[PDB]
PDB file of C-alpha atoms in Angstrom:
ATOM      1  CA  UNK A   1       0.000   0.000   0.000  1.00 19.91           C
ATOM      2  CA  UNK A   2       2.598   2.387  -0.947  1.00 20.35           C
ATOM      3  CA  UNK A   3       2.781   2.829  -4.868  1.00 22.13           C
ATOM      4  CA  UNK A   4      -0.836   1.663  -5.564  1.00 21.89           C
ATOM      5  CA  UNK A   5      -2.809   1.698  -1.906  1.00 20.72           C
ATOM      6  CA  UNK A   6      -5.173   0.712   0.121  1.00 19.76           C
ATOM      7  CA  UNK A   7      -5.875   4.709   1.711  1.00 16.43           C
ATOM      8  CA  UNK A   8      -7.283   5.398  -1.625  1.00 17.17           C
ATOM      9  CA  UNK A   9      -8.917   2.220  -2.254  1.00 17.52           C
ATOM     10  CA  UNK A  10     -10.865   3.025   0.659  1.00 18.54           C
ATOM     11  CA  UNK A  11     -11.637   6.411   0.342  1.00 21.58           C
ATOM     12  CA  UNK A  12     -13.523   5.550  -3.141  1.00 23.63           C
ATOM     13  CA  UNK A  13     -15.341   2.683  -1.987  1.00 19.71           C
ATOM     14  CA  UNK A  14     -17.990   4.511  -1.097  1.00 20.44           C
ATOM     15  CA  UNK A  15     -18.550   6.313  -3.998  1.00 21.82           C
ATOM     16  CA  UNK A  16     -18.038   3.479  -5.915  1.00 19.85           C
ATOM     17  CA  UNK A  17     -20.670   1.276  -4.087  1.00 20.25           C
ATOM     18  CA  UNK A  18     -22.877   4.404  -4.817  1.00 23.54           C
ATOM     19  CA  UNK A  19     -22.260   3.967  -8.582  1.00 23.93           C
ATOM     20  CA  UNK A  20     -22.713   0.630  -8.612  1.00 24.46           C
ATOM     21  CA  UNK A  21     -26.407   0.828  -6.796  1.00 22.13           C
ATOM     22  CA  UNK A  22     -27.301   4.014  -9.636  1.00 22.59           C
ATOM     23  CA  UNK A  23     -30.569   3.159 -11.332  1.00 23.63           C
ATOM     24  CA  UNK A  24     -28.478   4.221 -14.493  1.00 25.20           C
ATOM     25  CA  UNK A  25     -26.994   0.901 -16.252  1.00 26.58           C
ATOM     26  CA  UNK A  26     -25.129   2.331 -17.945  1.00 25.50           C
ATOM     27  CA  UNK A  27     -22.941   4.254 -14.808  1.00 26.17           C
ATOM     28  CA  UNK A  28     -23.437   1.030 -13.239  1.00 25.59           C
ATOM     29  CA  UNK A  29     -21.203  -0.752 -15.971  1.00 24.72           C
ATOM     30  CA  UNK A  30     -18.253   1.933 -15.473  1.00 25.55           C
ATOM     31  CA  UNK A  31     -18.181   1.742 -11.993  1.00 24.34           C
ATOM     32  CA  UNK A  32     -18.399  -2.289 -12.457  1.00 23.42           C
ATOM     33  CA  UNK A  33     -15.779  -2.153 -14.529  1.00 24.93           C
ATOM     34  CA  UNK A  34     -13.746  -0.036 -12.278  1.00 26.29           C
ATOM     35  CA  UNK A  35     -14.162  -2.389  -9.251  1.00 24.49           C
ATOM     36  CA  UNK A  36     -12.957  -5.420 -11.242  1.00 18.45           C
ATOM     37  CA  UNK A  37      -9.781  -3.468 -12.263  1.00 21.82           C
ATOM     38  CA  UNK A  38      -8.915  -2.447  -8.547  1.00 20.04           C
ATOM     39  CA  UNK A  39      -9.891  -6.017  -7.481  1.00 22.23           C
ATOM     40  CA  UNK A  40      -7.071  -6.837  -9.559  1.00 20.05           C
ATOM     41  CA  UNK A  41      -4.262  -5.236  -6.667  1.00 21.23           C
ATOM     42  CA  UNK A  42      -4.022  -6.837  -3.475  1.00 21.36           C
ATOM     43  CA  UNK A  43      -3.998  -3.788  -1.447  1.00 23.90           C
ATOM     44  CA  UNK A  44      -7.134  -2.445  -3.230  1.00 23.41           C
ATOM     45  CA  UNK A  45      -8.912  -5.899  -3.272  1.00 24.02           C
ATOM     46  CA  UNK A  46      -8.456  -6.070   0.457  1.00 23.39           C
ATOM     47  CA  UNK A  47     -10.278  -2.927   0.670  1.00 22.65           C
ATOM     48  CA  UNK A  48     -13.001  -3.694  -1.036  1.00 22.35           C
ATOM     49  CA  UNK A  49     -13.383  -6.882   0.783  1.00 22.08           C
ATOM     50  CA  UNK A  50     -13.681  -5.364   4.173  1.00 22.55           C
ATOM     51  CA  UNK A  51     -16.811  -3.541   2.372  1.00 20.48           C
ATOM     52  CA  UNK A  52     -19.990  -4.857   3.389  1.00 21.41           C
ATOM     53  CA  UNK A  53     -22.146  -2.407   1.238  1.00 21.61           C
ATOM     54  CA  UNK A  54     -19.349  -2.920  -1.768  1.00 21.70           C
ATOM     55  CA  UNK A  55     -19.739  -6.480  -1.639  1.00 21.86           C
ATOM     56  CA  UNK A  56     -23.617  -6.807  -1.825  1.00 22.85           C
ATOM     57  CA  UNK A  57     -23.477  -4.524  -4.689  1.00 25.07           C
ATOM     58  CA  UNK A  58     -21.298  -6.002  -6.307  1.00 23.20           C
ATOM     59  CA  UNK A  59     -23.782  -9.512  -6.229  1.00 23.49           C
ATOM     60  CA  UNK A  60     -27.055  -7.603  -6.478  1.00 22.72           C
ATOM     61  CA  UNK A  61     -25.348  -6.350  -9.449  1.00 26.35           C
ATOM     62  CA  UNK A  62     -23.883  -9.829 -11.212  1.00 23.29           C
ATOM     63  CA  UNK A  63     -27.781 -11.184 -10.189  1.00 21.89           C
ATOM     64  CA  UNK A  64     -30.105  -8.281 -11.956  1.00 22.98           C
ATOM     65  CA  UNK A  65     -27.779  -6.957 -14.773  1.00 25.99           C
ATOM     66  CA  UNK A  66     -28.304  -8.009 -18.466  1.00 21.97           C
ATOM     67  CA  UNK A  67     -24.781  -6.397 -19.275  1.00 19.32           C
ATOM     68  CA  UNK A  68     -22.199  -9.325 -20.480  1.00 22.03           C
ATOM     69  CA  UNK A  69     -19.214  -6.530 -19.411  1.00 19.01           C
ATOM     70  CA  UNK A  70     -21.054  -5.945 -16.023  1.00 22.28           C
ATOM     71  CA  UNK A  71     -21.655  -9.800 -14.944  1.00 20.55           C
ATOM     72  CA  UNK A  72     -18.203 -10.439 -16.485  1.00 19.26           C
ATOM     73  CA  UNK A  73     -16.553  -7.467 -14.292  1.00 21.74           C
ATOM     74  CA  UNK A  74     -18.757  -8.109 -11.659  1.00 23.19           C
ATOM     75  CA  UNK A  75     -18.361 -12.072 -11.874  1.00 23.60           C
ATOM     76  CA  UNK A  76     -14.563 -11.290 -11.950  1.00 21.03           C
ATOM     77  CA  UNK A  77     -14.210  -9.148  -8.996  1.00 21.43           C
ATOM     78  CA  UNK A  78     -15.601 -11.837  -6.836  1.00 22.91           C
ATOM     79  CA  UNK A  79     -13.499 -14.334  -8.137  1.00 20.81           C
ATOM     80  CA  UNK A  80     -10.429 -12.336  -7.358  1.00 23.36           C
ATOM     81  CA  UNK A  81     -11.958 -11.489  -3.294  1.00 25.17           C
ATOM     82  CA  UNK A  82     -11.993 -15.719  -3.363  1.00 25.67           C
ATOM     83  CA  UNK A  83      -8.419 -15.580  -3.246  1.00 28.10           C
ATOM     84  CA  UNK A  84      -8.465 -14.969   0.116  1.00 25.81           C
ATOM     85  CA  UNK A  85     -10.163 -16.242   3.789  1.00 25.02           C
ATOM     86  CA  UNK A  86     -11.675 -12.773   3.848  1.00 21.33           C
ATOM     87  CA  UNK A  87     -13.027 -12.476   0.583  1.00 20.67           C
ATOM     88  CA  UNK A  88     -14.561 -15.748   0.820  1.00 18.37           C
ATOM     89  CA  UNK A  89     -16.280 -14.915   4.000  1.00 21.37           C
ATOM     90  CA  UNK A  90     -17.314 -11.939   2.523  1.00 21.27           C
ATOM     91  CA  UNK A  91     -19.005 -13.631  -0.392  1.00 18.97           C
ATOM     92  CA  UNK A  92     -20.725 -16.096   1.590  1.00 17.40           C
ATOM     93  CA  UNK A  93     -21.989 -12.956   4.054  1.00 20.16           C
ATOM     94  CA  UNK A  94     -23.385 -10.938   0.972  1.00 17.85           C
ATOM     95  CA  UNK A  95     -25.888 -13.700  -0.337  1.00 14.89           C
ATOM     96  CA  UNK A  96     -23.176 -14.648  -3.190  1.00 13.63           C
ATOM     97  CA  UNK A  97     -23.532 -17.748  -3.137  1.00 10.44           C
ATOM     98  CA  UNK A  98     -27.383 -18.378  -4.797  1.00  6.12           C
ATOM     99  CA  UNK A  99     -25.969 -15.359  -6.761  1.00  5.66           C
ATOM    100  CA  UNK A 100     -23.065 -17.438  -8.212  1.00  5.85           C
ATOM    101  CA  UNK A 101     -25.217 -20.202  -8.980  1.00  3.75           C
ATOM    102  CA  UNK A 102     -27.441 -18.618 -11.530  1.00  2.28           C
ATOM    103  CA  UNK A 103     -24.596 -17.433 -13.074  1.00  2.83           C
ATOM    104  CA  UNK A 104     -23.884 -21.269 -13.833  1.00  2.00           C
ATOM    105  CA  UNK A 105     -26.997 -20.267 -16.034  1.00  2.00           C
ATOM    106  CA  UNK A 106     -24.542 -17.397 -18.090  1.00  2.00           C
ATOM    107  CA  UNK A 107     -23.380 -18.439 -22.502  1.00  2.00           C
ATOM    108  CA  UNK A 108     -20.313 -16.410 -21.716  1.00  2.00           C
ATOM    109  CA  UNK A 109     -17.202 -18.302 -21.559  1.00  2.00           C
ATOM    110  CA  UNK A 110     -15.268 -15.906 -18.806  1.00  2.00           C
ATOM    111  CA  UNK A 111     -18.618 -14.983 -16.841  1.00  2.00           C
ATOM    112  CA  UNK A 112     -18.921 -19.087 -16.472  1.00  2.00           C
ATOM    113  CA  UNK A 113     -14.951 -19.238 -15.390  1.00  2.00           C
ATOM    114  CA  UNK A 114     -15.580 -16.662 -12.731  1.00  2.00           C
ATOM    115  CA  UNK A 115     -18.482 -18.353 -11.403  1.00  2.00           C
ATOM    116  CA  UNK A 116     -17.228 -22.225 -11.292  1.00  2.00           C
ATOM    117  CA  UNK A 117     -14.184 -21.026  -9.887  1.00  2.00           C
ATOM    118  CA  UNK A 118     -15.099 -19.014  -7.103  1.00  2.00           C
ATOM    119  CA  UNK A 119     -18.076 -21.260  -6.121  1.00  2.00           C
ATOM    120  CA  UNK A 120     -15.092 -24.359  -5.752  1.00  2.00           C
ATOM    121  CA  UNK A 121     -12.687 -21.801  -4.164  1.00  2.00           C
ATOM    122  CA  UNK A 122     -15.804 -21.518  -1.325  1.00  2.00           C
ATOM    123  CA  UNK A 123     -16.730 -25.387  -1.698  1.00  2.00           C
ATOM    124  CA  UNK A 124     -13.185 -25.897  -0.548  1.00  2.00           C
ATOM    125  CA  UNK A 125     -12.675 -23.324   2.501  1.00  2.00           C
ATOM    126  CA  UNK A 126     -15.801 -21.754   3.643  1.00  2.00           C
ATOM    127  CA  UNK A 127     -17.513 -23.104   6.050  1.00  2.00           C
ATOM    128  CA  UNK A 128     -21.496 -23.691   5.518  1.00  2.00           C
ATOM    129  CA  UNK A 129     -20.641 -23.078   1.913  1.00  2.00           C
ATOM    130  CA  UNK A 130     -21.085 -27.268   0.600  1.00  2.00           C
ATOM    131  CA  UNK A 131     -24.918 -26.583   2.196  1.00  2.00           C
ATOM    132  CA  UNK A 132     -25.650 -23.250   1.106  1.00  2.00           C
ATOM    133  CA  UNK A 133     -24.512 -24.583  -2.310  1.00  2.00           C
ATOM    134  CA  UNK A 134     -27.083 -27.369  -1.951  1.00  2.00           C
ATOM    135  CA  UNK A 135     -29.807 -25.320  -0.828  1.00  2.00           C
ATOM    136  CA  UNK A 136     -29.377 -22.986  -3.494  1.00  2.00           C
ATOM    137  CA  UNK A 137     -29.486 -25.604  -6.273  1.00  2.00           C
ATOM    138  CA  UNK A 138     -25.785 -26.243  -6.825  1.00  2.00           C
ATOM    139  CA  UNK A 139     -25.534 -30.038  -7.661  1.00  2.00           C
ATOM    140  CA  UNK A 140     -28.436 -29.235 -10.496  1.00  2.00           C
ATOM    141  CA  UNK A 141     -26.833 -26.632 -12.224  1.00  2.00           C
ATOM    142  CA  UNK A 142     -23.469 -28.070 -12.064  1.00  2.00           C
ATOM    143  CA  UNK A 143     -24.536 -31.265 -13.548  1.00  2.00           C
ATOM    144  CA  UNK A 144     -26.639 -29.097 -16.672  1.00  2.00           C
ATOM    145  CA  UNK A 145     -23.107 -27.341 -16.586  1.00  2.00           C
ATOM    146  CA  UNK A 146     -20.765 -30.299 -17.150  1.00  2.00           C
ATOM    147  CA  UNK A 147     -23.088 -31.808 -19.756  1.00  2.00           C
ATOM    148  CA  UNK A 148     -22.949 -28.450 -21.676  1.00  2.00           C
ATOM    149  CA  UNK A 149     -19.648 -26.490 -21.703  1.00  2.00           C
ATOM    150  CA  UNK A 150     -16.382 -26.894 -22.831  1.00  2.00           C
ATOM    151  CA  UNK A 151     -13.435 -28.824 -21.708  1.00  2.00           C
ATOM    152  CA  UNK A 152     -11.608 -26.125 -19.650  1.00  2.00           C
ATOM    153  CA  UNK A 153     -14.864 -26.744 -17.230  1.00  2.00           C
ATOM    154  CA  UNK A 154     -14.961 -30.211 -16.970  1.00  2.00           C
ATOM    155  CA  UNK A 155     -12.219 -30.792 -14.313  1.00  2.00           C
ATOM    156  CA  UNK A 156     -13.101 -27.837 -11.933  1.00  2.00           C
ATOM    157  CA  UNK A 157     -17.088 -28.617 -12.365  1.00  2.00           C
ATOM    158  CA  UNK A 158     -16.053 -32.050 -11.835  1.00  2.00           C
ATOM    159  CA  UNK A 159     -14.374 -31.386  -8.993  1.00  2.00           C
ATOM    160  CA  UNK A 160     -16.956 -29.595  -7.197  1.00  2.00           C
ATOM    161  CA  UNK A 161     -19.777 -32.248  -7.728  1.00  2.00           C
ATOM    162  CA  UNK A 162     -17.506 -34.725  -5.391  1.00  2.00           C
ATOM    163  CA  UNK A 163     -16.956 -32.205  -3.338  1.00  2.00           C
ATOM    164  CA  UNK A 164     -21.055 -31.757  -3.024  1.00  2.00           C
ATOM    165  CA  UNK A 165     -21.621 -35.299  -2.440  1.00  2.00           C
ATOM    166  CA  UNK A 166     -18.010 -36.100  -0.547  1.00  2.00           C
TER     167      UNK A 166
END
C-alpha cells in the first residue's frame, strides 16, 4: 500500500458502491468495470473486501444486470476477493452464493470461469458453503453445466460435484 494503496482504495469505496447501486446501467457498468480493475491489486482488493455495502453490490449487481461486461466485471471481482479467507467470507456474508449459482446459467465463456471457480474456491474453505450450495441448487446446475460447456470446465465442475456429495 505504498505505490498503488489501500488509503485510496478506501476512500472511493464509497462512492463506488454508490455507482454501482445508480438506477443508471449504464454508470453502473463503469463503476463495475472499475471495481474489477482495482480487485485486480491486493492492497485495493483487500479494501473492497472489508466492504460490506461494496460487496452486496457487487452480487445484487452480477444477479439483476443483463450487461455481459457488467456480470463479467462483476463475476470477476468476486473471483479475485476468493483468493483470500476474507473475501470468501465476505461472499458467503453478501448472499453470493445463490448469486453465483445462476450465473452457472450465463453463454459467456469468462462470466462461467468466474463463477465455477469461485463457487469451488468456497466449496473448498468456507464453512457452511457445501450446504448453502445445496440449498441454493448447486448439484443441479453443475450437472446441466458439465453436460454443456467446454473442456476447460470439466475438471473444476467435476471437482466440485464430489466435493457436493463427498
Amino acid at each position: 500500500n505504498y505505490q498503488d494503496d489501500a488509503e485510496l482504495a478506501t476512500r472511493a469505496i464509497p462512492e463506488l458502491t454508490k455507482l454501482l447501486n445508480d438506477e443508471d446501467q449504464v454508470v453502473v457498468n463503469k463503476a463495475a468495470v472499475m471495481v474489477h480493475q482495482l480487485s485486480k491489486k491486493e492492497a485495493s482488493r483487500h479494501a473492497i473486501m472489508r466492504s460490506p455495502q461494496m460487496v452486496s453490490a457487487i452480487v445484487r449487481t452480477m444477479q439483476n444486470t443483463n450487461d455481459v461486461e457488467t456480470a463479467r466485471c462483476t463475476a470477476g471481482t468476486l473471483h479475485n476477493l476468493s483468493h483470500h479467507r476474507e473475501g470468501l467470507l465476505a461472499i458467503f456474508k453478501s448472499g453470493g452464493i445463490p448469486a453465483l449459482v445462476k450465473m452457472l446459467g450465463s453463454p459467456v465463456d469468462s462470466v462461467l470461469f468466474y463463477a465455477i471457480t469461485t463457487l469451488h474456491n468456497l466449496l473448498l474453505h468456507q464453512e457452511g458453503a457445501k450446504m448453502a450450495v445445496r440449498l441454493a441448487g448447486g448439484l443441479q446446475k453443475m450437472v446441466a453445466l458439465l453436460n454443456k460447456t467446454n473442456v476447460k470446465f470439466l475438471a473444476i465442475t467435476t471437482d466440485c460435484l464430489q466435493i457436493l456429495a463427498y
